[PDB]
Amino acid sequence: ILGGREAEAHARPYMASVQLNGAHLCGGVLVAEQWVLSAAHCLEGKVQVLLGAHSLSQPEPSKRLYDVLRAVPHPDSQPDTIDHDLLLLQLSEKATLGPAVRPLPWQRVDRDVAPGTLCDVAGWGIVNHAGRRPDSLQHVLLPVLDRATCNRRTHTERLMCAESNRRDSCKGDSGGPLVCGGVLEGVVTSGSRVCGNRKKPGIYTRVASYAAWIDSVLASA
Numbered sequence: 001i002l003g004g005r006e007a008e009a010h011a012r013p014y015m016a017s018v019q020l021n022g023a024h025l026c027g028g029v030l031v032a033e034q035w036v037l038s039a040a041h042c043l044e045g046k047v048q049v050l051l052g053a054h055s056l057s058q059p060e061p062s063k064r065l066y067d068v069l070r071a072v073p074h075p076d077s078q079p080d081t082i083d084h085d086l087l088l089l090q091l092s093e094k095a096t097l098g099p100a101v102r103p104l105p106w107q108r109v110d111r112d113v114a115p116g117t118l119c120d121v122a123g124w125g126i127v128n129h130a131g132r133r134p135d136s137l138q139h140v141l142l143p144v145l146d147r148a149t150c151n152r153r154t155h156t157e158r159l160m161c162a163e164s165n166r167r168d169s170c171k172g173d174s175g176g177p178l179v180c181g182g183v184l185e186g187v188v189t190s191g192s193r194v195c196g197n198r199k200k201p202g203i204y205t206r207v208a209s210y211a212a213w214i215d216s217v218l219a220s221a
């Protein structure tokens with residue numbers, strides 16, 4: 001997260017850290033008791049998920065790490081694209097929910113967010129262009145752009161864009177949430193891109209666009 005501020009401890013309880021060998025790799029969103037939604041190139045090996053956290057390092061009453069039973073990348077995703085860039089991770093066991101750990105509702109209604117709406121993006125991604133990794137969760141409020149602006153700058157119905165005027169998501173915020181009026185609208189994409197540049201907006205997979213896939217995987221809870 002660039003141009004942001006420290007999040008308040010535990011105030012965003014859906015936030016997950018997707019990890020490889022005890023290192024934060026990707027954002028994720030608790031979307032059910034045993035499933036975390038992330039991006040498809042996060043996975044790409046022994047994968048684990050950390051819930052309940054503000055600091056990555058420090059002892060906190062609510063922190064807990066989990067193993068992964070099963071990775072289900074979208075079957076049309078390809079290594080070389082950010083099309084269908086979603087990933088469902090089945091935890092090895094159901095998570096212990098509470099004030100600091102709970103699922104965030106995701107947008108089932110296939111409708112665009114109102115342009116200019118400030119949504120909230122959080123992550124343990126880099127907080128500067130020298131790639132500094134924050135211990136504690138950061139966040140930043142960001143305005144959503146209209147679909148036409150999203151098509152022109154960058155280049156489909158399956159992606160959305162947000163303004164990035166030195167405030168942006170970046171590397172390691174991948175797989176993480178764009179939250180708008182308390183609801184998950186975007187999943188930060190997981191291919192590399194320029195961050196913090198007005199002209200090259202951040203890109204987010206429209207979760208609504210994949211309602212049928214997500215249901216069909218979780219159709220077995």
Ligand SMILES: N#Cc1cccc(CC(=O)N2CCC[C@H]2C(=O)Nc2cccc(Br)n2)c1
Pocket residue numbers: 024025026041042043124125126133170171172173174189190191192193194
């Ligand atoms: N730049 C850039 C960039 C912007 C969005 C997404 C990505 C891809 C990314 O961040 N990935 C690919 C999956 C592994 C993950 C990653 O590299 N995480 C990572 C790596 C170093 C530091 C931190 Br914090 N996080 C890169």
